[PDB]
Design a protein around this nucleic acid. Structure first.
Ligand SMILES: [Zn+2]
Length: 129
DNA sequence: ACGTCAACAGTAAACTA
DNA sequence: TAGTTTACTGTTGACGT
């Protein structure tokens, strides 16, 4: 809880610095669905999860026995949880719930695409056991 | 109204400094 | 070492039948 809230607060300030370091400078009210997805793609550089391409032999193998030049991405579970924290952080800082940019349909569709593509590429299942 | 899903909450690990 | 945060887990509330 306390670690979760500080994690949420840090993500909210990280998203704030992201908007200020955006070029052109991006305001919160102008954070369209495309811009939120642009933010989620920007975070792939900090991911640690190997997502194999369809030409790599290790596609669908969660524990390859050799390195490959396939890119590292944010896992679906990281993005799913981050969206939950940012959804709350937006409303905890006075944002109207029905204007929540992290609740836009484009966010839901993107997370589903990441879930289905990574499950095939990684060979893992994101369903709750 | 169970059966699932959505909407966040919460924990674990290992990498960075 | 200790802090961070990606990655994985958990669950109340809401949805769907
Ligand atoms: Zn690969």
């Amino acid at each position: 809880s306390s670690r979760y809230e500080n994690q949420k607060r840090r993500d909210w300030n990280t998203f704030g610095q992201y908007l200020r370091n955006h070029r052109p400078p991006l305001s919160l009210s102008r954070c369209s669905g495309a811009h939120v997805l642009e933010f989620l793609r920007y975070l792939d550089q900090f991911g640690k999860t190997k997502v194999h391409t369809n030409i790599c032999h290790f596609y669908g193998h969660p524990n390859p026995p050799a390195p490959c030049p396939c890119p590292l991405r944010q896992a679906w579970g990281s993005l799913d949880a981050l969206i939950g924290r940012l959804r709350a952080a937006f409303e905890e800082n006075g944002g109207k719930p029905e204007t929540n940019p992290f609740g836009a349909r484009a966010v839901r569709l993107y997370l589903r695409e990441v879930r289905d593509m990574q499950s095939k590429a990684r060979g893992v299942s994101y369903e709750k056991k």
